[PDB]
């Protein structure tokens, strides 16, 4: 006979994924950072080497806070949290930040305007792309199995130089292992370090 008179609930699967990601990086000595979702343009763009008149901003991708020219917005990624952490802490800094982020995409089967992002930042003496790849590979093993790894191939972001797009080798399934575009990475741009 059924015995469950207090039916079980569920934490959200995104939240649990974030939880698993956070535990993965904690277990490597990193720390979690958090910050506001309504953020200053200073931290969300200008400190990230991404000025007013650069090709693109929020004519097409950012929610802006009223009124026009208030330099407030809903953050479009969690980097401003990383930027706050760099101001507030002593170096070296090894930091994961996971949070709600906002883009002006219509909700369909493969896009959501309200989404959740994970970002990492390692700032130390002597860090290289080699270290970037090791972190990315550890992260992929945690979320995709011991057979997983990453490849990087050049791209462009204003806050990194070199910049690359990250593909993950998803072995465990997909109905037959294939590369899948995962996210993006790069070495922190010197203008971000000065700011």
Partner 1 sequence: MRLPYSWLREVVAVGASGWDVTPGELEQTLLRIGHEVEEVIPLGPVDGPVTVGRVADIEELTGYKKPIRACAVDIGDRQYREIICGATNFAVGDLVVVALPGATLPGGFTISARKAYGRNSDGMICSAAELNLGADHSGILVLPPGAAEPGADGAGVLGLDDVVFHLAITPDRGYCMSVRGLARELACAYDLDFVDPASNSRVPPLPIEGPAWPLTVQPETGVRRFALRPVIGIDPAAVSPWWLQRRLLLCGIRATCPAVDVTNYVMLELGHPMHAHDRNRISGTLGVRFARSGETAVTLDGIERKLDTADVLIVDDAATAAIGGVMGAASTEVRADSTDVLLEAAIWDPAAVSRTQRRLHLPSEAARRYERTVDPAISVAALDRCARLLADIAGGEVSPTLTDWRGDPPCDDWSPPPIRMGVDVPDRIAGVAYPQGTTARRLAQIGAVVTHDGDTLTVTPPSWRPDLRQPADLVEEVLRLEGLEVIPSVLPPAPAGRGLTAGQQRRRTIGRSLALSGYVEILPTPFLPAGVFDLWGLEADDSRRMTTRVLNPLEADRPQLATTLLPALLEALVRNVSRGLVDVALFAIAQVVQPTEQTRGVGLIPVDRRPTDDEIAMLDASLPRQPQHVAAVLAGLREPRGPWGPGRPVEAADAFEAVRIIARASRVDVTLRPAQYLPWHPGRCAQVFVGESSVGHAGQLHPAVIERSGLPKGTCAVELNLDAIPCSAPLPAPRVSPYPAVFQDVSLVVAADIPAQAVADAVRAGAGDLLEDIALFDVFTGPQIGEHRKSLTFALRFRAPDRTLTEDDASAARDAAVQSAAERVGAVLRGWKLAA
Interface positions, 74-93, toward partner 1 (CB under 8 A) = 74, 87, 92
Q: Which residue, among 188, 122, 131, 180, has the nearest Cα to 151 in the 3D structure?
A: 180
Smallest gap, in angstroms, from Cβ of residue 29 to a second copy?
5
Q: How far is CA 58 from CA 12, 105, 147, in A?
A: 30, 12, 40
Q: Binding site, residues?
A: 161
C-beta of 32: minimal distance to a second copy in Å? 11
Q: Which is nearer to ligand H2L, 147 or 179 (CB)?
A: 179
Q: Binding site for Mg(2+), residues? A: 161
CA distance linking residue 195 with residue 117, whole number of Å: 23
Applying CB under 8 A, the residues found at the interface with a second copy are: 6, 26-29
Tell me the residue length of the chain: 195
17 lies in the site for partner 1, by CB under 8 A: no
Would you give the distance in Å from CA 152 to the centre of its chain? 16
Smallest distance from the beta carbon of 4 to ligand H2L, in angstroms? 42
- How many residues bind partner 1 (CB under 8 A)? The answer is 99
- State the binding partner of 89 from a second copy, ligand H2L, partner 1, none, CB within 5 to 8 A by kind: none
Q: Which helix (H) or strand (E) holds 143?
A: helix 129-144
């Amino acid at each position: 006979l059924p015995s469950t008179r207090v039916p079980a609930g569920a934490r959200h699967p995104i939240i649990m994924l974030a939880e698993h990601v956070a535990d993965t990086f904690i277990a490597m000595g990193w720390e979690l950072a958090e910050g506001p979702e309504v953020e200053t343009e200073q931290f969300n763009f200008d400190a990230l080497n991404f000025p007013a008149d650069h090709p693109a901003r929020g004519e097409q991708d950012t929610f802006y806070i009223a009124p026009e020219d208030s330099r407030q917005l809903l953050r479009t990624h969690t980097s401003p949290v990383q930027i706050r952490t760099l101001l507030a802490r002593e170096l070296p800094v090894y930091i994961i930040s996971i949070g709600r982020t906002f883009r002006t995409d219509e909700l369909d089967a493969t896009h959501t305007p309200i989404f959740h992002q994970v970002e990492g930042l390692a700032v130390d003496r002597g860090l290289s792309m080699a270290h970037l790849r090791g972190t990315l590979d550890a992260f992929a093993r945690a979320e995709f199995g011991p057979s997983a790894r990453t490849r990087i191939r050049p791209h462009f972001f204003p806050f990194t130089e070199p910049s690359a797009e990250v593909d993950v080798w998803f072995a465990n399934k997909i109905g037959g292992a294939a590369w899948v575009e995962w996210g993006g990475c790069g070495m922190v741009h010197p203008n971000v370090l000065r700011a």
